[PDB]
Design a protein around this ligand. Structure first.
Ligand SMILES: *[C@@H]1O[C@H](CO)[C@@H](O)[C@H](O)[C@H]1NC(C)=O
Ligand SMILES: *[C@@H]1O[C@H](CO)[C@@H](O)[C@H](O)[C@H]1NC(C)=O
Ligand SMILES: *[C@@H]1O[C@H](CO)[C@@H](O)[C@H](O)[C@H]1NC(C)=O
Ligand SMILES: *[C@@H]1O[C@H](CO)[C@@H](O)[C@H](O)[C@H]1NC(C)=O
Ligand SMILES: *[C@@H]1O[C@H](CO)[C@@H](O)[C@H](O)[C@H]1NC(C)=O
Lengths: 50, 66, 43, 49
């Protein structure tokens, strides 16, 4: 939705070009608020757990 | 013992002074089969770190990594 | 210097302190972790 | 199905058991960094180690 497309490059050959949206997509992991799931209502807390 | 010493790319340090930093030094050398292997690296990746660790561990029983 | 000091002062206790692993593929007792708590090199 | 009509696609890659634990992450790195993956999930209870 909010574009900012960053890609993890091929670090196997001499690359330390870090991925910029590392924490930011982790923010997407922190704000992954859902309610659909066979296990139940899946939602991540401040600890990143169920 | 056999100790491998590898470095990155900073400080422009070449390799021969690393050979000579061990040789005339260690006056009180009590173990006999002590040898250093001074190497460098052309990359900055953990892939080559895994590769050179698995090659130097098989490389005549290296017991030290720096 | 610390590595050679540890190998020298641990050689006097047990002989075959060098105990390396053969290869990473295809899957010890005397270590220096409990030995170099305190060591001295060149003062 | 329900995630719009954008031209994004998906590809699957799953790596299996190796008895040596270093070569596990070795197969992972050379098979997924070259694949440019975005998430990594491990689902192995029945290991003897
Ligand atoms: C994307 O992120 C950059 C900073 O990395 C920022 O300058 C830019 O405004 C962002 N674009 C938007 C608004 O999505
Ligand atoms: C957890 O509890 C309910 C109880 O009926 C269960 O049906 C469902 O699997 C779970 N739902 C939620 C709220 O996660
Ligand atoms: C230079 O890089 C190549 C490729 O990894 C390697 O084979 C060679 O040993 C490297 N040389 C040094 C001294 O780092
Ligand atoms: C380390 O210090 C302890 C006392 O804290 C001492 O007993 C011991 O001799 C020292 N280590 C050596 C030289 O073995
Ligand atoms: C897509 O996945 C298949 C099976 O895992 C793999 O063989 C292929 O290299 C992947 N990449 C492409 C070309 O999309």
């Amino acid at each position: 939705e909010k574009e900012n497309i960053t890609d993890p490059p091929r670090g196997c050959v001499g690359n330390t070009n870090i991925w910029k949206t590392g924490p930011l997509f982790k923010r997407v992991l922190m704000s992954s608020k859902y309610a659909d799931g066979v296990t139940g209502r899946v939602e991540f807390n401040e600890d990143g757990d169920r | 013992l056999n100790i491998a010493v590898l470095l990155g790319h900073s400080h422009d340090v070449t390799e021969r002074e690393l050979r000579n930093l061990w040789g005339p030094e260690q006056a009180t050398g009590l173990p006999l089969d002590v040898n250093v292997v001074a190497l460098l690296m052309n990359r900055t990746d953990p892939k080559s770190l895994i590769t050179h660790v698995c090659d130097l561990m098989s490389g005549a029983r290296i017991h030290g990594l720096v | 210097g610390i590595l050679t000091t540890a190998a020298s002062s641990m050689l006097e206790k047990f002989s075959y302190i060098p105990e390396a692993k053969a290869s990473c593929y295809g899957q010890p007792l005397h270590t220096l972790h409990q030995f170099m708590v305190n060591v001295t090199w060149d003062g | 199905k329900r995630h719009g009509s954008w031209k994004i696609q998906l590809n699957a890659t799953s790596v299996t058991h190796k008895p040596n634990a270093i070569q596990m992450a070795l197969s992972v790195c050379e098979d997924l960094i070259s694949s440019q993956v975005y998430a990594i999930l491990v689902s192995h209870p029945p290991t003897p180690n």
